[PDB]
Amino acid sequence: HQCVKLNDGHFMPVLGFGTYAPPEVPRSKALEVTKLAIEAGFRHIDSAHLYNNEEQVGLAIRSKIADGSVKREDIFYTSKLWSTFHRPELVRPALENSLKKAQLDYVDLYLIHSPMSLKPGEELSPTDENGKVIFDIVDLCTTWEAMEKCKDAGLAKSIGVSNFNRRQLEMILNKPGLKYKPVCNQVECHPYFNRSKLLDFCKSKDIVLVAYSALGSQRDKRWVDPNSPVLLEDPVLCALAKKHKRTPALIALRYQLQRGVVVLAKSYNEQRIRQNVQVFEFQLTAEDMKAIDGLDRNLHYFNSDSFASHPNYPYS
Ligand SMILES: NC(=O)c1ccc[n+]([C@@H]2O[C@H](COP(=O)([O-])OP(=O)(O)OC[C@H]3O[C@@H](n4cnc5c(N)ncnc54)[C@H](OP(=O)(O)O)[C@@H]3O)[C@@H](O)[C@H]2O)c1
Ligand SMILES: Cc1ccc(NC(=O)c2cc3cccc(O)c3oc2=N)cc1
Structure with missing residues (x-):
């Protein structure tokens, strides 16, 4: 049920359903599970x-609205501008294309x-002849301006x-003439990678931190090393799971909720x-919280350093 108030005055449900599935999983599954998630209680x-999967996820949302389960206002729907669209003249059409695919009038x-x-x-990922990805140099403040324009248009x-x-x-945040700061920053976050001070920063700035791979990544081979720890097999999460008669996944999710994530x-x-x-x-x-805090190992699951050269690479 619970929502957090966003610094632009909108409300974000604190539990969200992640919809990514690898290219193998048939697209029809995105429809089915998203309806299931809405039936379950997810509203984000x-x-x-x-x-x-925007077509299928949007179709699920329209179906739940149309069968009378929820209203458009109950659903908090997120899309993301992909990195090939950072040039400002590409921002608004990318959003409109996402909306045409999902068949909604706006994203929350x-x-x-x-x-x-x-x-x-x-x-989506342009490669040169040697198969390496071609970067672009874009001042992300111009991207932000085009994002702000999408907000004023009511598209987001x-x-x-x-x-x-x-x-x-x-x-x-330092941007001259800034109309809107980001309501949120969505980053990888889980007991092995807690983002304690990034989170503290955000709390100071009225920017929600949003955790993804909060159950430990789907452990895709293309992006994740098999030798990495499996977060849900962790001894302390398994112990806390048996103590509360819940599961390690529920422990992880509750952990984030109680740190205001x-x-x-x-x-x-x-x-x-x-x-x-x-x-x-x-x-x-509070002691369970302390013990989960103790698992922090600054561990990325997404191996990104194949892009270390990028001037905007985040782990610089
Ligand atoms: N901003 C970004 O760059 C970024 C990057 C990655 C992901 N994301 C978003 O974050 C979402 C979630 O992150 P993620 O895809 O890395 O996966 P995740 O939330 O870490 O989930 C990982 C795996 O845990 C399993 N799982 C789910 N519930 C469980 C439970 N109750 N008990 C045991 N296992 C459970 C799921 O497998 P089953 O399907 O078999 O249940 C799932 O594949 C994505 O779907 C995507 O929307 C954003
Ligand atoms: C130069 C450059 C630009 C962007 C990226 N990023 C990714 O490969 C992503 C993978 C991904 C995978 C699953 C779910 C996501 O939400 C994902 O989001 C991503 N941004 C890497 C290198």
């Missing part, structure tokens, strides 16, 4: 141009998906950013979708 839905949240700008083209209720470090946040949870399994909303049913003790 996270998607992006990159995910290649439009994010700059990443700070690392890419070469403009109808290619709120606007924010994703995968931005402290300096990139402040570069947007809005948390996403991907699941394409009906049981787990309906289990994840139980995060509102129990509390962790």
Whole structure:
């Protein structure tokens, strides 16, 4: 049920449904599970141009509105501007295309998906002849201006950013003539990577931190090393799970909720979708919180340093 108030005065449900699934998973699944998530109780839905599921996720949302389960106002829908669209003249059409695909009139949240700008083209990841990705140099404040223009048009209720470090946040915040600061920063966050001081910064700036891969990434081989720890097998999460008679995933999600973090949870399994909303049913003790805090190992699951050269690369 619970929402947080955004600095532009809109309200974001603190539990969101992540919709990304690898190209293998048939697109029809995005429709089914998103309806399941809405039936379960999720009211915040996270998607992006990159995910290649906006049509199906939007269709699920329209279906739940049309069968009378919720109203458009109950749903908080996020899309993300992909990095090949950072040039300002590309921002508004990318949003309009996302809206045409999803068949909604606005998104509640439009994010700059990443700070690392890419070469403009109808290619999602443009490669040169050696197969390496071609970067673009774009002053992200101009991107932000085009985002603000989308807000004024009513195409996006709120606007924010994703995968931005402290300096990139402040570069947007110091911007001359800034009309709107980001309501949120959506970054990887979980017990192995808590973002304690990035979160503290954000709290100071009235910017929500939004956790993704908060259950530990889907452990895709293309992006994640198999030798990495599996977050849900962690001894302390498993112990706390058995103590509260919950699951390690529920522990992780509740952990974020009690540090004032809005948390996403991907699941394409009906049981787990309906289990994840139980995060509102129990509390962790202050000592449980301390013990989960103790797991912080500054661990990225997404191996990104193949892009270390990028001037806007966030882990510089
Ligand atoms: N801004 C960004 O750059 C960025 C990057 C990555 C992701 N995201 C967003 O964040 C969302 C979630 O992050 P994510 O895709 O990395 O996955 P995640 O939320 O970390 O979930 C990881 C895996 O945990 C499993 N799981 C879910 N609920 C469970 C439960 N109750 N018990 C045990 N296992 C459970 C799921 O598998 P099953 O499907 O089998 O349940 C899922 O594949 C994405 O879907 C996407 O919308 C954003
Ligand atoms: C130069 C450059 C620009 C952008 C990126 N980023 C990614 O590859 C992403 C992968 C991804 C994967 C799953 C879900 C997401 O939400 C994702 O979001 C991403 N931004 C990397 C390098």
